[PDB]
Amino acid sequence: VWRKHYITYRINNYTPDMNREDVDYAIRKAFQVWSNVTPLKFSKINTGMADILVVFARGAHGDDHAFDGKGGILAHAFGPGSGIGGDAHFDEDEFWTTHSGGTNLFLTAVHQIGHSLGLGHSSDPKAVMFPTYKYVDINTFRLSADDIRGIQSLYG
Ligand SMILES: CC(=O)N[C@@H]1[C@@H](O)[C@H](O)[C@@H](CO)O[C@H]1n1cc(CN([C@@H](C(=O)O)C(C)C)S(=O)(=O)c2ccc(-c3ccccc3)cc2)nn1
Ligand SMILES: [Ca+2]
Ligand SMILES: [Ca+2]
Ligand SMILES: [Ca+2]
Ligand SMILES: [Zn+2]
Ligand SMILES: [Zn+2]
């Protein structure tokens, strides 16, 4: 688990799929999902070393877990720790979108951030930490009880 409650993140690079403001906005909103139900606070930084580095990359990208082209694996993230720990990577060969029509960035980022914070997967198809991606209505997006129980048992 992170052994602090103030956690920074940095966006390493941007996908050409979406407007930058939409990337910023999806990432910022995905952190809010988790800071709304825990005592964690997340700050974006623009220089220096962040706890959570957000990367868009294709294929092999230097961490011994290469991506696989369009389809299959969408993204992955490392559990809490220094260095690469916490970092969240998105497969650039996906087509990242603000709504539907590709792979939704916001929803995928919520799921990945859950792993950066120390969460495993849920057996609840309504949970964001469910292992399978589906587009759900963002307007009615809510964490499930199982998400809330898991994050709260790590962080309060
Ligand atoms: C054991 C298993 O899950 N096998 C399937 C296998 O069933 C599937 O056919 C294959 C396709 O290549 O992907 C395999 N797969 C998927 C994954 C999970 N993926 C990663 C992850 O959990 O974050 C990992 C790489 C870290 S993942 O597939 O990339 C992934 C990423 C995000 C989500 C998600 C969930 C809820 C909301 C929004 C997005 C779902 C899946 N791992 N292995
Ligand atoms: Ca890190
Ligand atoms: Ca892929
Ligand atoms: Ca892409
Ligand atoms: Zn990676
Ligand atoms: Zn997962």
Instruction: State the Cα–Cα distance between residues 117 and 95, nearest whole angstrom.
Output: 25
Q: How far apart are the first and last CA of the chain?
A: 12
- Name, in order, each residue with C-beta under 8 angstroms of 68's C-beta and a sequence gap of 6 or more: 91, 93
Q: For residue 144, what are its two tokens?
A: 């499930």
Sign of CA dihedral 52, 57, 60, 61: negative
Is domain 1-156 annotated with CATH 3.40.50.300? no
Resolution in A: 2.0
Which residue, among 64, 47, 56, 54, has the nearest Cα to 95 in the 3D structure? 56
What is the identity of the amino acid at 143? Answer: L
Query: Is 131 a pocket residue for ligand 1 (Cβ < 6 Å)?
Result: yes
47 CA distance to ligand 4 centroid (A)? 25
Domain boundaries, given as residue ranges, for the chain:
1-156
Q: DSSP letter for 78, please.
A: P
Name the phi and psi angles at 27, rounded to 5.
-70, -50
Which technique was used to obtain these atomic coordinates? X-ray
3-state secondary structure of 103: strand
97 C-alpha to ligand 2 centroid (Å): 25
Single-letter residue type at 55: V
Distance of alpha carbon 123 from its chain centroid, rounded? 19
